[PDB]
Symmetry: D2
Subunit: 274 residues, 4 copies
């Protein structure tokens, strides 16, 4: 495969429906040597079997909010793997309240919690493992249209992803010198532990399926393959790029209609709403 002999660190796995898992699965099929991290011993209960299924004996603890966990991580991968060719940064969080209602009511607390866990953590993770990154290494993070466009109740998480994307741009220039790449994969809505916690997510998912050019929701396999590509030398001439894997949803300037032309009606007014 295109990741043969390549070593990579996967951060974000919570279960087999995780974006990072789809990416790890895809990376595995291409011969990569993987390493995984887990937030707490409860998630490790799921990250471990997942890890075994992908020929990986490297499982470490890493709660991005605990700076000492980073110090341990550096020592871990340097001992167990010597070096890293790629990193997957698939982590984000914000209090449940922050994602409902408006951005106005956001508490300074929820703001910082979402900024730190979802943005700064990319900086700390990358700086921490910087001296262990081989030349040509690739750093991939996960974003969402909500960064540049308004998406119902995404709120502060929207402000985070915008900063996240900017960081990707600045990190690509900081590491470009040493031939290292940085990108963001902008996936469309998809069912995962984090999303199943968001209010009326089934709706966001229906609006995308019905109004997206390909008229479908992206699979975990599709997101995994786009990621794998971005992390492989297949894309060594690609950096500081925000790559959409959303069934083409990003192009829409309004609700789809194209299929119906009698008088032109919204596809929404005909599917799951009549």
């Amino acid at each position: 495969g295109f990741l043969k002999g390549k070593k990579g660190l996967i951060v974000g796995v919570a279960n087999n429906k995780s974006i990072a898992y789809g990416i790890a699965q895809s990376c595995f099929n291409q011969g990569a040597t993987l390493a995984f991290t887990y937030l707490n011993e409860s998630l490790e209960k799921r990250v471990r079997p997942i890890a075994q299924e992908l020929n990986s004996p490297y499982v470490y603890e890493l709660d991005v909010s605990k700076e000492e966990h980073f110090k341990s991580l550096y020592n871990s991968v340097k001992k167990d793997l010597g070096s890293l060719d790629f990193i997957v940064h698939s982590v984000a969080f914000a209090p449940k309240e922050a994602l409902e209602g408006s951005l106005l009511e956001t508490s300074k607390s929820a703001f910082n919690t979402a900024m730190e866990i979802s943005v700064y953590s990319l900086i700390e993770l990358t700086n921490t493992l910087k001296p262990l990154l081989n030349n040509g290494a690739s750093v991939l993070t996960l974003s969402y249209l909500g960064s540049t466009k308004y998406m119902a109740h995404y709120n502060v998480m929207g402000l985070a992803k915008a900063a996240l994307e900017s960081a990707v741009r600045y990190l690509a220039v900081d590491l470009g010198k040493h031939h290292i790449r940085v990108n963001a994969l902008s996936a469309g809505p998809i069912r995962t532990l984090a999303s199943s916690g968001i209010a009326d997510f089934r709706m966001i998912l229906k609006w995308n399926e019905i109004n997206a050019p390909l008229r479908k929701n992206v699979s975990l396999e599709e997101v995994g393959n786009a990621g794998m590509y971005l992390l492989s030398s297949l894309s060594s001439g690609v950096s500081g790029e925000v790559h959409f894997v959303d069934a083409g949803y990003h192009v829409m300037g309004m609700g789809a209609v194209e299929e119906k032309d009698n008088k032109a009606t919204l596809l929404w007014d005909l599917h799951k709403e009549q």
Copy 2:
């Protein structure tokens, strides 16, 4: 004037070169009643005469990192002016170190400092004064190209302005229901207290000057008129807009060369570099 009888709150005045003042100056000539805020007593020594120079007796204290200041602001204007038609958010801060070197070396501390003072403050300032805002009210903040593009050692400030512009988008939806507008004016480099205290600023300035389409730097007056417009009814149809006042610089995909056709040479190699 297009602001006669209109009441606005100006946040961000440090001296008479501040962007916030230019916009204030312009709104003044249009008949707006002005109100100013200062960070500390030291700054009040400069904000005071200015307010007086522009007919304003309503001067209040406001350090965005102090939440109790916000409740006072409220009571202060609710008592003095009763209502607000437009708010100017001209604030941004980050430690000196964070704006030099690389984004990678940024600390969790400077990060949270950059994000709070420069982004969350717009949220608290707005949500606080919300019930004092008349229908048709306009909220303007200031950003910089660094938000979506790499600019020399802008580092963490670039992440801030990226969330800032995204916050402008969500606030516009949050407050649009109530007929209120939220925009951002992305001004080009311009010499002010805060900018003069930034490494090699002389260079960013000259580069924009030579490479900009209008072949010059933007004046404080031009930024002020751009803002006055965004804050006047003249733009009642505008919202969630990042308005560029940069002498067209933002359109360049490389250094200028145009006038000289002989064999095409960078204007920079001909201007102040021979």
Copy 3:
């Protein structure tokens, strides 16, 4: 006003609901000396009173597809006004067929007509009057979100507008040196002659009203006021800018929902579609 003693050419008026009219009306109210053109004698019947109504006795014939009309035009304003401070390029066309169905069915013939009348015309109009443009002159054209986002059946006109926004960018660099500004005002949907001829235009309009941040359609006055600003010295620091005047519509990444939060319902499913 901010256009006192300023002379500008207004191109594109068909009746009193035209965008070029709103722009004209607004510029008139600011002391501008206007001049108008007309496609044919039938439109001249409406461009004449309108022209009188705005203290303008300069009315010339101009069909952008007729190269000779441009030669007359130059001679006309050189005699009648000596010079131009601003220009309004408000012209667009494409066969009815091309604006329905898909982009795939567009004939080579419709493609060219749409590109010529809608894009090249800006190039010819500007290049022709270039010798009569005073320093600080401002060139304003009109575009629509369909340039960068897909909009129902906008098709080839979507391709035109995108080339047009890129044209705006290249012309700003070409004329930038001579202190001349070039911008585009991207207006939101609004009822006019050309639009009343578009299939199911009412829907585009309804959708914007319900889903736009300000929850209303933009008025002809708001478009004019924006254009006037773009054409006045008030924006002497703005160039190569695509300025949106759509009630904040461009920020939306999906249909509005906000006002209803029980389970978060689409405002569309509650307004003009129960």
Copy 4:
């Protein structure tokens, strides 16, 4: 490979340095059965051997300016290959003058030639071959940063590329209904027949090399692999996307400076210019 048993049409091969060839090469190594096309007999002398080396006996004539060639194409692929899984649209032309001097001097003639060969041809190519496109088919075209940013003397080609990306957006919606993908690969400067004939091209190249984050120029293999990715099921979740293979150049907001921080100096002022 990821295109094993996948049949595609390669349009635009001029020699072993063409972008279309690199993509073909990368696709050939992924198991695809290829088919090529040539403009005139003078190019068939370079396409035939390339087609042979890549295992292809399907070499057809196609001058996008001639509509009859499209009818033959259809018949040629329907008879020789039965159906198509992917199409490569790597064609663009504009008169030599148009690409030098200013966009202002462009003639109506050259405007129409640029638009037609570089934009309309994507529309005819896809609509003609449409009945031969299998579900999940992928359509890829090539663009350049000049489409949305000013690039020296790119001029009218910049307008074409902007319409081209817009067409990619509308075509993606027209063919998505049938599960077909449409994307654009925006490559960075690279040595080809067409580019070699461009004014001051070495400069554009050195400028991207020094200012690009990965500090190099992209290779034909990288552009090739990026396109093969876009054209394979590996990217079945991506559509209407403009994908940048430019060593990350697009992220730059100004010239590079990074590595040097004595007073912060341009990398350009130190490399190939002292």
